[PDB]
């Protein structure tokens, strides 16, 4: 496992990147986050153990695990739903199409963490590190998360709460075709000093 | 692997080893 | 430890609700990785996978030839009226530090132990001087001599130094096919670190810096042209290809996110802005729930 | 025991303070035997794309909310290729796994009576005509119940636990799951003009909390999921 | 022989008039095996809802038409409960059975070519620009070949008869069917922008008749059935 | 499938009368080819005939090196009084479809699996310049790096993308024999597709075009002058050679006879006239009844 | 299971909230074999004044904390016997054992992700020159991340992972626990020039408590016990 | 055929495959 900067914006500096914050809400069905799964594009999977070592090669295979672990208070209880949305359209913004999809309905307890698969579902063996996101052979679909009663915590617990979002590849994970790695660059002989 | 050499560290690569245990960092508990 | 040539298999599992059996749920404070099971999760098929794994084995990932060095020096007569020193020469302290895809590549695991094969690649070219016709490269012949620590350098094309009678040396010409050998596994200890938390020596003061390595006293390698020099101006330039065989590596690391700035520390400045920025690793989208890369109908 | 996971298809539900898992009946949906069957043309039974959770909308729980009702197949007629398999054919049979969520903090009070009701016919107060299509075929959107004391007819709320039923007592539990087979006197049903589940969610004991923890926004969510899932007479969609 | 009947699901096709069974490179379509698949996801295998004849419009057969083609699945991803879990799945794999229908009097004479080519990609005359999605992806409604000569590609119609075929003759035939297994370099494909195979109707010999027999009106009607369907990646319509 | 070296041996016939009994006739319609047999339509002698079939094998008839790229650039410095980028390189997406005798070749095939054989053949001459003598051809070094889709590419000739430390390059030299390697079969599919009657993305769009395979995303070949630029210009060609290898061909294909245009689509303008025009591939003759080779005597 | 005991020589820490006990790398610290060995004089194996817990000083855990991280065997370089074996040894072996301290309410929420780190060489921020020995060498007082997100490296928090870890999520843990064998290239080094294992503390999601419960003073506590500990090369104190 | 390399993909020619079967394309008809 290792965090995904799943909060990639531009107020968020440092740490505030790997954790996605969470409220209790006044409305209901909402999305609260979403994670896009393109591995070789600028995304919350790069920097990740994953993310780092897949990007030197240039084809993949195999099942993804995301878990998330809710950093909030023991009072704070609330079930979420996490969908995974395999590629053809629109990355979902209502449950009630979410839920169409792959997803697992995260209640909070005493284990404070849930895992949903990423199942390998594509037509080729093999995908893409391809710069073109929408590229048949590149897209792994979306992954969503959604309220599915609500975050409830009392008044002596913090209405706002962290949940930190772990990737990694499963056993039928396979990397195939080397590649430099697109991460880290160089114009100069590296000197003695700076 | 094949070598024309006297010395072992001159041979070529060795790519047959097919070992992995993972549970050294996926999970390392004493209590299972 | 199983062998594992192709990657898992996957099983049929079938509708499953039963009491005490949570395999989503898992507990991350233990310091593990989720155990879950597509199989357990999902409704899954059986599938027989015969996708191989050779081309994640560390002995391919990082057994591969890499640029370490690339050095050039200008082959002509360097005697003045003054100096008679030639300095067709250059001298390279050995490491894999000077070049960042090996670097990294390598600093992905704290220890290693691997013989390495080094692959000399010389080119020349003629200098454009006020006036040379372009006259051909000459087939010269270059001596890469490599010299353990301790063992007096030379300071000039002509020094004596260059017997190689117990340093080994390598005579090679441009038109060969490039120099070719095998350094073996030469650390005082059980594995190479590619970091070293800790000092090189036993006093305290600033001089002895942090991160050097003292069993990464790993010697040079002087290459010459032994050829003296000709009436005209010739760019002789190196480019040192590393290879590592029999690797074996131990505790894998964090990788490298910013830039390395030098070859004797990990220091770092970042860039700018995203991406690999400080605060800012990876590149920005507007929110949360914003897809940069939605699909659109 | 408490933690339960129900996984169908591509679903997963997770819950670690649940009651138990109540089988209406003591039964377990099947598919039709072959010695039950009355329609002979070959039955479509795709498993997977109907056999699956379908969440439906959730409900707010307020301090003086008097109870819903979700009729099924209705609620689910129109939700995925569930609902396009209703809509191609003329017939259908399937059970139900309904899972009902609602979570408050340890220091919320409450009670939800979660009945799965067979054949509820709406008896209506007032007047003698009887209740229109629009007023029982809400769809995923379900219905109010008007007389919760009543179970919106001339029987009891308090003699409702005859029929398969959990609660949602916020001190024990969260989530409540009934398994619902095929309950009917025919071996199928149009699905477009008969519901033979109602899924009614009942308040018994208001939701309150003590000072700072009040008017707290404590959804109901509803999550069914069609059970050996079978149509026929397949023909355009209606 | 020549009469043959094609029972597949609810559909029944009789002809009196057939010349035989084409199965395309002699295969039969199957459904995935075990060792062939990719995506773990459990799929989805109606059998009856999908794996049935669709019988598309009818095309009028001019003594000037040059040729009609139907890209499958294009053709049927609208049809049906076949196009209802086309839009609800990322994944498809089928086979199909084509029959083609062409009747004329015994006075009438005619010849067309029935021809489903694998991967015809279209090539288009007089520009460098690839043809478009419009002009490509046409449904149920199918295309007319500007070029039969060519196959409307820079190939021949005449070295056409690689193709898994059959021609309508209406001295002997008035009816082509071909079976067509799953082409494709990968078990499964996106139906929505890849067609594996092109059904090509194109008269080699213009329809005919003598006095009186002229300008008779001849439709040309298409029914295609997928065979051993199946679908995965479950998720919402598209 | 029975085994076939050499071609069917020839039986004897004799005279034949017998009713129900029609070999020469049959029924295209049913798509079947003529099954008629020499001995039941002439009579035949008996001819045993030894001709092997070896070399009419898809293995044979594909596995022959063939011209599938052709670059060349110019060695020498591109340094201006603006910028110092050099550009002694070529960078070519690579494809099979730029030379039609090997595109229509393996067009003649829908899909094919082939390990490849790629033999790199370099060539130098000495540009006409203003006044330059012709003072040789040098044995420069190159440097053929393959870059896979995704990876950075080299958009100088100093860049320090040619490190090729996972990128698979070869270092060869003009005088020396041509470089050669084998690239494995590669496409995330079980064979490539010469065809693809679909579109390569999910959306719409006018920019995401017809006939464009996303398996055949095929990467890049990053080709280099490794020595710096001489004094003096040279035009540095290479040509790519490519040699399939253990070929597996599935369902054969109509030939190409309309010429091709471009490598992004099948699209064709056609001759003028016969023959291989859109409206008459064969040439003319006067009438059917014409014989345009009569002997005559 | 949650609850744990861990009995060192003296010492003795229960804990009933941990997770479990991670054993960096699989391994449990062993004494140095004979086939290992390299010093040929004979080591001192104290076993109970140097294998015992070592608490240090503990830290206040801000809402804006960055992290902190201790040195092994720095921390421990003046402390008790062990300090004086190593003062008076120029060879150190050991393994050690790291319990990481925090409590907080049940209203209380944060996580603390606690990392040992093999050859943590610090990487700093805006300079060429190296890290000075007083900015490394800090001991039993530690250090602080100046850049937790980089781990005061180029490298990242988010694959620190990688490492033996645990965290302290105030909901499910007050305690973590790692047991770090001998960690180095060499069967022995010199500890007061160089440092094997760096225990990091980085809160990944800050302190924070509702009305009333914020701003609650908040100690980190670390436990380091030495682990089979043996020395080498007995002379004077240094 | 012939190899000097360990993989498999790197060797020569596999020019041995006699098999034919027209039938596939010649007789494609399910009634012979």
Not at chain 3, 16 to 40: D, F, H, W, Y
Not at chain 3, 83 to 101: C, D, G
Not at chain 3, 195 to 208: I, L, P, R, S, W
Not at chain 4, 146 to 156: A, F, H, I, V, W
Request: a neutral charge; one cysteine or more; charged letters at 15%.
């Amino acid at each position: 496992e290792s965090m995904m900067e799943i909060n990639n914006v531009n107020d968020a500096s440092g740490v505030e990147r790997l954790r996605v914050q969470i409220s209790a809400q006044s409305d209901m069905d909402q999305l609260l986050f979403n994670i896009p799964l393109d591995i070789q594009l600028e995304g919350p999977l790069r920097n990740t153990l994953l993310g780092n070592i897949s990007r030197y090669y240039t084809h993949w295979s195999g099942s993804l695990e995301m878990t998330f672990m809710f950093c909030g208070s023991f009072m704070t209880t609330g079930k979420l739903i996490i969908c995974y949305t395999p590629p053809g359209g629109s990355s979902p913004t209502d449950r009630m199409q979410a839920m169409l999809a792959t997803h697992v309905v995260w209640d909070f307890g005493l284990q404070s963490s849930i895992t949903i698969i990423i199942p390998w579902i594509s037509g080729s063996h093999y995908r893409m590190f391809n710069t073109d996101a929408k590229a048949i052979n590149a897209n792994v679909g979306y992954v969503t998360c959604f309220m599915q009663t609500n975050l409830v915590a009392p008044v002596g617990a913090a209405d706002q709460c962290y949940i930190v979002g772990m990737v990694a590849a499963k056993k039928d994970f396979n990397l195939r075709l080397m590649r430099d790695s697109p991460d880290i660059g160089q114009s100069a002989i590296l000197p003695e000093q700076a | 692997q094949i070598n024309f050499y006297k010395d072992s560290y001159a041979a070529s690569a060795s790519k047959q080893d097919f070992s992995q245990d993972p549970s050294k960092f996926t999970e390392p508990v004493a209590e299972a | 430890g199983e062998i594992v040539k192709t990657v898992a298999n996957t099983v049929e599992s079938e509708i499953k609700a039963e009491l005490g059996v949570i395999p989503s749920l898992n507990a991350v404070e233990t310091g593990a990785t989720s155990n879950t099971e597509p199989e357990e999760a999902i409704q899954t098929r059986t599938v027989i996978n015969m996708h191989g794994t050779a081309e994640c084995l560390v002995e391919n990932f990082l057994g591969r030839s890499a640029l370490v060095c690339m050095r050039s020096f200008e082959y002509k007569n360097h005697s003045t009226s003054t100096s008679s020193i030639q300095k067709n020469f250059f001298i390279w302290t050995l490491n894999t530090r000077e070049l960042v895809q090996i670097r990294r590549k390598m600093e992905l695991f704290t220890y290693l132990r691997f013989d390495t094969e080094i692959t000399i690649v010389p080119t020349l070219r003629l200098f454009s001087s006020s006036n040379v016709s372009f006259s051909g490269l000459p087939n010269l012949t270059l001596q890469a001599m490599y010299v353990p620590t301790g063992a007096r350098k030379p300071s000039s094309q002509d020094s004596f130094e260059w017997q190689s009678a117990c340093n080994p040396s390598v005579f090679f010409k441009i038109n060969d096919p490039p120099a070719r050998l095998t350094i073996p596994f030469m650390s005082i200890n059980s594995a190479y670190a590619n970091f070293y938390d800790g000092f090189a020596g036993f006093e305290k003061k600033a001089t002895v810096l942090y991160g050097i390595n003292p069993a990464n006293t790993m010697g040079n390698l002087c290459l010459r042209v032994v050829n003296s020099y000709q009436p005209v101006q010739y760019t002789l330039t190196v480019r040192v290809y590393m290879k590592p065989k029999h690797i074996k590596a131990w505790a894998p690391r964090a990788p490298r996110t910013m830039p390395y700035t030098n070859i004797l520390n990990n220091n770092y400045a970042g860039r700018s802005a995203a991406p690999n920025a400080p605060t800012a690793i990876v590149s920005h989208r507007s929110t949360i729930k914003t897809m940069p890369n939605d699909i659109n109908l | 025991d408490r933690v339960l996971q129900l996984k169908l298809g591509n679903s997963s539900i997770v819950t670690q303070e649940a009651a138990n898992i109540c089988c209406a009946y003591g039964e377990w949906p099947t598919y039709l035997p072959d010695n039950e069957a009355v329609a002979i043309d070959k039955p479509t039974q795709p498993e997977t794309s109907t056999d699956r959770f379908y969440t439906l909308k959730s409900k707010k729980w307020e301090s003086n909310s008097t109870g819903w009702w979700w009729k099924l197949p209705d609620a689910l007629n129109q939700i995925g290729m569930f609902g396009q398999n209703v809509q191609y054919h003329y017939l259908y049979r399937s059970g139900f796994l309904c899972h009902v969520q609602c979570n408050a903090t340890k220091f919320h009070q409450g009670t939800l009576l979660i009945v799965a009701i067979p054949e509820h016919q709406i008896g209506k107060k007032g007047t003698g005509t009887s209740a229109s299509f629009a007023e029982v075929m809400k769809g995923a959107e379900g219905g109010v119940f008007e007389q919760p004391y009543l179970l919106d007819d001339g029987t009891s709320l308090a003699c409702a636990l005859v029929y398969p039923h959990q609660w949602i007592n916020l001190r024990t539990n969260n989530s409540a799951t009934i398994v619902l087979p095929w309950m009917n006197s025919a071996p199928m049903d149009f699905a477009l003009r008969h519901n033979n589940w109602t899924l009614a969610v009942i308040p018994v004991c208001p939701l309150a909390g003590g000072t700072g923890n009040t008017n707290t926004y404590v959804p109901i969510t509803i999550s069914i999921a069609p059970m050996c899932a079978e149509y026929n007479g397949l023909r355009n969609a209606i």
